Amino acid sequence: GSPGIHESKEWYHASLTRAQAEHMLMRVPRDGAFLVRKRNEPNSYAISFRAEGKIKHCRVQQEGQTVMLGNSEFDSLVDLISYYEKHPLYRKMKLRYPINEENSS
């Protein structure tokens, strides 16, 4: 709604690939690559986010009621991620962009 959760996009923090998906998203050709997936640590999820000349991601603490990041509490990773789509600003970054290859597109 105002934030994301439904109209947003990176609320997929349940069963996908691990470092692989983020490395893929962080190393993709275009900027914007966003993706949340499981990490090897318990209560430790992560968020892949590729920004123009800037890239950084780490572990998020998930609880069966309210997930929390390394600074604030959030209703499921999708909440803070939805906030990012709503307030991204990074030119082609808005939690709703694929990773187009310079060579292909």
């Binding site: 470092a19 990490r39 968020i47 991601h57 990041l69 600074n71 803070l80 990012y84 991204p88």
Partner: peptide, 13 residues
Amino acid sequence: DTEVYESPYADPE
């Protein structure tokens, strides 16, 4: 490396 961080994305920006 491939499986070990701590503070991910907390603020808009």
